[PDB]
Amino acid sequence: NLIFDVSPVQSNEGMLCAFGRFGIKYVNDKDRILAPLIKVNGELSKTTFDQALIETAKKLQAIRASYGKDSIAIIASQRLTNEEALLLTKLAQKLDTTVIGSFDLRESVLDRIFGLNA
């Protein structure tokens, strides 16, 4: 279950930068959290996935109920797969929030000129 090396693929110039070649070290990192944490008595403590996800859903629903629509922001990283991003968009629709974005995202200019930001 440990990664031991990373090698480039001889596709074109067969090259990897520092990140792809060496930053795969975080997979073996022992500081990774493997169980969810919820706030008991004001401190984060381990729990089960079912209870944590139930708490997440109830907290989001409480925020939506008390403060109305468009009151929940989803700030998703840009390293997720296409399916995960689509699922996050679906969930944002389920929460009646259009605030679906990322802190790594810059203001777009190309979609106002050519039509697509690509």
Partner 1 sequence: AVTGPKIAIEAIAQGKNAARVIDSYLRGKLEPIKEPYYVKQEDLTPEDFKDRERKPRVPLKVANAEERKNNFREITSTMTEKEAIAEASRCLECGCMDYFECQLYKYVNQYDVDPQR
Say whether residue 58 binds partner 1 (CB under 8 A): yes
Say whether residue 75 binds partner 1 (CB under 8 A): no
Q: Map the footprint of partner 1 across residues 30-49, applying CB under 8 A.
A: 41
Residue 11 per-residue DSSP state: S
Structure tokens at 19: 């990140």
Distance, in Å, from the CA atom of 25 to the CA atom of 112, rounded to the nearest integer, reads: 40
Stretch that binds partner 1, among 26-34, 52-60, 78-86, 107-115 (CB under 8 A): 52-60
Of residues 3 and 40, the one with the C-beta less far from partner 1: 40
Distance, in Å, from the CA atom of 24 to the CA atom of 8, rounded to the nearest integer, reads: 13
Structure tokens at 33: 């959290």
What is the binding site for partner 1 (CB under 8 A)? 41, 51, 54-55, 58
